[PDB]
Design a protein around this ligand. Structure first.
Ligand SMILES: *CCC(=O)N1Cc2nc(-c3cc(-c4cnn(C(F)F)c4C)c(F)cc3F)n(-c3ccncn3)c2C1
Length: 277
């Protein structure tokens, strides 16, 4: 609804936060047009000439990403603006703790059951909000969940796949791998893989198995193994996210209720060394 087109003089890039095939993420500073205030931002500069869309069609996709701020949800990121030159530059408020994937890997022996279950609730609340806005994410993963504070996570990169036109096979539902079908139920599958990443403290799903063999392995009934800290109650919820029939998978609304019940008594559902305080 409110997409701000930023001029290159309004914002400055200070340092690189991370790189990749997608492009680069910078920690920067923004001074809005009719304002006298410095705002700490994160700038995602995408790789030039990847997408065949003209600047007008790129703007339409960015408008949709910006519309998500209305009415809004605390667990979904906010696109502050877009800068279109030879590359696409996306601007958001800086999340100082980075993504949830790096956070759980770096803080493994200090994360208790209360944290893991509350993050699952928060991710389902943000995903359920995107489903309310009729928006399919297409790339939900622990790398796409940002940490504002350890007790407040937000989903990022929604609509970024549609803007662009390595495929994340190990997070995709079987119907997305075989037919490129993307729905809110295929996002439920990716949510299950994201919960599995958190419960394993950042383990790589199907490690060693080539991406070309994932579809046949799923057709044989093989799923991600039960993480050591999970009880059968938690594992059964991730297992239901990985059903062949998309309509039989739980809804984000139901996942909020299930994980919310577990977060009320977390030591009963997750067994972690260090929670015996
Ligand atoms: C493990 C950390 C990691 O992998 N990061 C990747 C990443 N992306 C961003 C990021 C994302 C966006 C963006 C793209 N699409 N939308 C929205 F949904 F429409 C957004 C908000 C962006 F505009 C800038 C951007 F930097 N970050 C990041 C890093 C720090 N603070 C915020 N975002 C990361 C980290």
């Amino acid at each position: 609804a409110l997409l701000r087109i930023l001029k290159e003089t309004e914002f400055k890039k200070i340092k690189v936060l991370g790189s990749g095939a997608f492009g680069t993420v910078y920690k920067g500073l923004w001074i809005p047009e009719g304002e006298k205030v410095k705002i700490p931002v994160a700038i995602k500069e995408l790789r030039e000439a990847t997408s065949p869309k003209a600047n007008k069609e790129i703007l339409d996709e960015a408008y949709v990403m910006a519309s998500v701020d209305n009415p809004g949800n605390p667990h979904v990121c906010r696109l502050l603006g877009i800068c279109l030159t030879s590359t696409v530059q996306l601007i958001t408020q800086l999340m100082p703790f980075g993504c949830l994937l790096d956070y759980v890997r770096e803080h493994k022996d200090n994360i208790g059951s209360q944290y893991l279950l509350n993050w699952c609730v928060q991710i389902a609340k943000g995903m359920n909000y995107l489903e309310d806005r009729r928006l399919v994410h297409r790339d939900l993963a622990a790398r796409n969940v940002l940490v504002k504070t350890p007790q407040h996570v937000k989903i990022t990169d929604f609509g970024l796949a549609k803007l662009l036109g390595k495929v994340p096979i190990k997070w995709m539902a079987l119907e997305s791998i075989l037919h490129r079908i993307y729905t809110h139920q295929s996002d439920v599958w990716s949510y299950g893989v994201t919960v599995w990443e958190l419960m394993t403290f950042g383990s790589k799903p199907y490690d060693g198995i080539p991406a070309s063999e994932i579809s046949s392995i799923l057709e044989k009934g093989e799923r991600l193994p039960q993480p050591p800290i999970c009880t059968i109650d938690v594992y059964m919820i991730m297992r239901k996210c990985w059903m062949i029939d998309a309509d039989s998978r739980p809804k984000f609304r139901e996942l909020i209720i299930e994980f919310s019940k577990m977060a009320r008594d977390p030591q009963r559902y997750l067994v972690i060394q260090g929670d015996e305080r």
